Amino acid sequence: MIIPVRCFTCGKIVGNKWEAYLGLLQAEYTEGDALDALGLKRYCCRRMLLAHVDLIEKLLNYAPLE
C-alpha cells in the first residue's frame, strides 16, 4: 500500500527514501544510478524501492471527502 518503514531483510530505514526516489526519477536518472545516489548498498534495501508499487496514491482517489 504505502512504502514500508524498514527494509524486510536487514533493517535499514527505507521509508524516508521514497520521496527522494521519485524526485530523482523526475530528473531522469536511471534506477541503477538513483538507488546508488540514495545510498542503498545491499540489494535487500534496493528491492524495497525497485519493486514497490504505490497503491495509496491511487487508493486515495476513491476515499470519501468533503
Partner 1 sequence: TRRPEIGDKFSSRHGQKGVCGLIVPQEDMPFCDSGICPDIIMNPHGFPSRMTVGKLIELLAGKAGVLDGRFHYGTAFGGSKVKDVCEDLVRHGYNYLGKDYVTSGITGEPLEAYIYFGPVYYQKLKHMVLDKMHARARGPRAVLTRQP
Partner 2 sequence: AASQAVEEMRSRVVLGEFGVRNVHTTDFPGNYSGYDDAWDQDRFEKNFRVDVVHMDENSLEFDMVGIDAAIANAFRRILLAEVPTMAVEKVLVYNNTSIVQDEILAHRLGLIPIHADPRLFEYRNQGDEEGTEIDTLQFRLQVRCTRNPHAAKDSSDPNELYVNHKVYTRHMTWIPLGNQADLFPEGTIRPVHDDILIAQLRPGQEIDLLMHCVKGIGKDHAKFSPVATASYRLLPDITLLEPVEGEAAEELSRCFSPGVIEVQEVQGKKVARVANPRLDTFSREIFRNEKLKKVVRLARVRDHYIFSVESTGVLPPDVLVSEAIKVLMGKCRRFLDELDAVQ
Partner 3 sequence: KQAMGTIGYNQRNRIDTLMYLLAYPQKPMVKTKTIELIEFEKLPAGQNA
What residues form the annotated binding site?
A: 7, 10, 44-45
Instruction: Return the amino acid letter for 24.
Output: L
Please identify, using beta-carbon distances, which residue of 41 and 59 lies nearer to partner 1: 41
Decide: is 8 part of the binding site for partner 3 (CB under 8 A): yes
Element (H, E) at 25: none
Contact, 10 vs 2, CB < 8 A?
Answer: no
31 binds, among partner 1, Zn ion, partner 2, none (CB under 5 to 8 A by kind): partner 1
Residue ranges in contact with Zn ion by CB under 5 A: 7, 10, 12, 42, 44-45
